[PDB]
Ligand binder design. Structure first.
Ligand SMILES: [Zn+2]
Lengths: 319, 75
């Protein structure tokens, strides 16, 4: 007739909930997951008596508070989406080629392969949000389900749907921090207004959207000041463990008979106004990681998006 | 306060907002000026992608600031 279940949102704090077999779980309690499966629209049975359930909505005050500490400030639909994505992507697999892990193509997840494989190369990074860092450590251990589902949830991605790698990558990196020092200083100057330095530190100093080469990043810009006069800007200091430059897909020929400086890059195949395909690549020859498919080429005609450079140690006298 | 948003084609629109407005609301202003859904908009300022969880003040964006609008790719 009646059962009792343990309800949690963190797997550490549990509360007893009394239920009958008259109405559905959703009707009596809310959206609930049982061993990963959403059973909200089912009738409670004796087989689930005493078992633990993960609640996704209609949270108590205590559960809501613990939720915010565990996942950060998230929308009311986040928990459900995360739990749902976790169930959806359980069947996804990693391909391991010479110890290198790459997400196998499935349900339009190639953009995720590019994001994850790029993240795997970024040293000294960590996440402030406990659940994200926990899932991150699990990912580096060989179990990536939590991490994949989490970043999909934070990135508002939908299972099966195509998406943007760069967008997700920078969204994820915006939630991370560096375990070491990094510094980026822009110098702006104008004859009337004066000299102004713009300082960035930590992870923020290791990422830039709008440029894809070190040369273009260090180039001097010239524009109009607020006062209406000639204003300039130039990078005068850059000290990082690594450098991630991201921009629109631009076509070029990448060759190793030139000895490039960058370590890795992502590529968008197809036209930009339709559904395309992402491929991750590293230089060790160009090692191409096409969602589990690995190959090597000397050169490659491709549309590069994100580019990963080694540690920066740069200063300019600016003159 | 007026700001500037540049596209890939070339046309540059002007938006009248406030420091209190978040990126989620700024995308709503672009929605009523270009018709582009907020779900498919990427705003880039000072080399940084703008996240919906923060406002304009968090990125030190103010008067005569130029934003870059890039469409959300589908890979
Ligand atoms: Zn000036």
């Amino acid at each position: 007739l009646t059962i009792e279940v343990l309800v949690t949102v963190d797997g550490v704090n549990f509360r007893t909930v009394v239920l009958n077999n008259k109405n559905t779980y959703r009707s009596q309690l809310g959206c609930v997951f049982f061993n990963g499966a959403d059973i909200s629209d089912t009738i409670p049975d004796e087989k689930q008596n005493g078992h633990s359930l993960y609640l996704a909505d209609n949270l108590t005050a205590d559960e809501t508070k613990a939720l915010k500490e565990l996942y950060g400030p998230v929308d009311p639909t986040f928990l459900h989406r995360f739990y749902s994505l976790k169930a959806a992507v359980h069947g996804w697999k990693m391909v391991v080629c010479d110890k290198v892990r790459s997400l196998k193509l499935s349900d339009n997840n190639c953009y995720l392969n590019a994001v994850i494989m790029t993240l795997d190369l970024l040293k000294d990074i960590k996440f402030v949000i406990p659940a994200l860092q926990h899932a991150f450590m699990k990912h580096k251990g060989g179990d990536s389900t939590d991490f994949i589902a989490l970043i999909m949830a934070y990135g508002n991605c939908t299972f099966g749907a195509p998406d943007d790698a760069s967008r997700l990558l920078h969204t994820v990196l915006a939630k991370a921090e560096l375990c070491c020092s990094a510094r980026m200083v822009w110098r702006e100057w104008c004859n009337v207004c004066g000299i102004k330095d713009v300082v960035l530190q930590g992870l923020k100093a290791c990422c830039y959207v709008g440029v894809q080469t070190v040369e273009d990043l260090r180039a001097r810009m010239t524009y109009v000041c607020q006062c209406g006069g000639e204003r300039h800007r130039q990078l005068v200091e850059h000290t990082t463990p690594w450098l991630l430059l991201s921009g629109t897909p631009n076509e070029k020929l990448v060759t190793t008979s030139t000895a490039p400086d960058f370590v890795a890059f992502n590529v968008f195949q197809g036209i930009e106004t339709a559904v395309g395909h992402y491929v991750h690549a590293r230089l060790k020859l160009i090692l191409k990681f096409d969602s589990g498919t690995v190959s090597k080429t000397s050169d490659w005609k491709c549309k590069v998006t994100d580019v990963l450079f080694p540690g920066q140690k740069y200063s300019s006298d600016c003159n | 306060m007026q700001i500037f948003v540049k596209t890939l084609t070339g046309k540059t629109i002007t938006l009248e907002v406030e420091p209190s407005d978040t990126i989620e609301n700024v995308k709503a202003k672009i929605q009523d000026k270009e018709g582009i859904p907020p779900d498919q908009q990427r705003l880039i300022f000072a080399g940084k992608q703008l996240e919906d969880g923060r406002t304009l003040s968090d990125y030190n964006i103010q008067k005569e600031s130029t934003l870059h609008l890039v469409l959300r790719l589908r890979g």
